[PDB]
Amino acid sequence: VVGGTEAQRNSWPSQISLQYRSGSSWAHTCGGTLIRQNWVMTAAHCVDRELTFRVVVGEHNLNQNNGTEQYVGVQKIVVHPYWNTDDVAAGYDIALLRLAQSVTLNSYVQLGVLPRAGTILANNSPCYITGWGLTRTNGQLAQTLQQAYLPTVDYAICSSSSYWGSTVKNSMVCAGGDGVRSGCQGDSGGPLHCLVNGQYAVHGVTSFVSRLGCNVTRKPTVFTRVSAYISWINNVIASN
Ligand SMILES: [Ca+2]
């Protein structure tokens, strides 16, 4: 996250770090949202590579012991069947990970609340992106979890010529685009948290930014719209 601030430790307890084995160590690659004690919601493109993955819940600092983490392997990966890695603009950038063990819930580890099916947010609705992604375009991962205020940009504005044009679909949420704050590489798969009727809910799964850079005016960060996939998510969890 570019232009972010450090999140308090128990503000976003459904945020997870998705990591892959790298020789003797583990490397952060993406975010995700804990949605069941044994299921994580993330972006399909995050699990495109045939790597060994683990989830860390209760994580705040990737380079220090926080004394709150739980580490669990990924037992099964279900990518949306319409996902195509050479066409992120088509959508369907979502996947579910079944964890090998169920995690324990506490003030650092909670389930993400998902919106009702079909919910679309009014233009300029208040949302926060969270993640350990790059803090500058072509920069480096954050050590501590970051948050940035990204108000939504509705479909008619976001799909206009000056913004993303045909690249954005109604199965997506746009947020931000102010030129200062944005998602960045390493934030993919994590949540977009939006305040509705007094409660934060995870309306988006981080998916893409401009090839020109992360924080680019009129290229808001784009997210898979969770509320378009509620039946898909329930169908997988039920059938798995
Ligand atoms: Ca840590």
Side-chain angles (χ1 to χ4, degrees):
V1 332
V2 183
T5 60
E6 181 184 0
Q8 305 209 333
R9 208 172 275 290
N10 48 12
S11 284
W12 312 110
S14 70
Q15 167 92 57
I16 66 82
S17 168
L18 178 68
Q19 304 184 348
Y20 62 90
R21 188 146 206 131
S22 207
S24 68
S25 75
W26 291 90
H28 171 89
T29 189
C30 278
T33 295
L34 189 67
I35 60 167
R36 297 299 184 271
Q37 275 176 260
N38 61 335
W39 281 99
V40 162
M41 177 177 323
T42 189
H45 89 256
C46 285
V47 291
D48 266 344
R49 291 157 162 127
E50 325 256 0
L51 307 168
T52 293
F53 295 102
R54 71 181 185 180
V55 159
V56 192
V57 302
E59 191 46 303
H60 183 74
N61 193 316
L62 294 173
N63 305 105
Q64 303 199 339
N65 178 33
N66 294 106
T68 51
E69 303 93 326
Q70 299 166 50
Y71 303 86
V72 68
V74 174
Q75 179 183 85
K76 179 183 167 138
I77 295 172
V78 187
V79 174
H80 201 276
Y82 265 177
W83 169 246
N84 177 11
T85 296
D86 293 304
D87 196 348
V88 73
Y92 308 106
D93 189 11
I94 187 161
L96 297 179
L97 321 174
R98 190 175 72 207
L99 310 186
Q101 284 86 29
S102 293
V103 302
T104 302
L105 263 25
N106 58 46
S107 71
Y108 311 100
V109 183
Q110 294 278 313
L111 307 187
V113 310
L114 292 341
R116 315 153 131 203
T119 304
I120 114 133
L121 297 155
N123 191 52
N124 215 219
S125 290
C127 306
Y128 279 90
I129 190 171
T130 53
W132 291 274
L134 310 193
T135 59
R136 298 200 55 176
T137 292
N138 294 321
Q140 64 181 322
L141 298 178
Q143 301 200 154
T144 60
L145 183 65
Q146 302 286 297
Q147 66 181 59
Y149 185 68
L150 300 189
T152 66
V153 181
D154 66 25
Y155 171 83
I157 296 159
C158 193
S159 65
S160 74
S161 76
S162 324
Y163 288 78
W164 281 100
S166 77
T167 293
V168 156
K169 304 322 186 271
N170 191 59
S171 56
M172 301 169 185
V173 178
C174 302
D178 71 354
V180 174
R181 293 173 278 199
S182 76
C184 207
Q185 278 74 22
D187 287 321
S188 308
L192 178 70
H193 319 266
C194 304
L195 177 63
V196 188
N197 294 320
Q199 161 204 73
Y200 281 89
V202 176
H203 282 247
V205 175
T206 308
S207 182
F208 65 87
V209 290
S210 182
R211 295 173 10 231
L212 267 188
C214 298
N215 56 308
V216 173
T217 303
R218 291 185 159 82
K219 292 294 186 283
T221 307
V222 181
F223 308 79
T224 304
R225 170 163 68 77
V226 174
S227 75
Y229 292 94
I230 304 302
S231 301
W232 178 77
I233 297 169
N234 284 341
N235 280 344
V236 175
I237 285 168
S239 95
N240 279 295

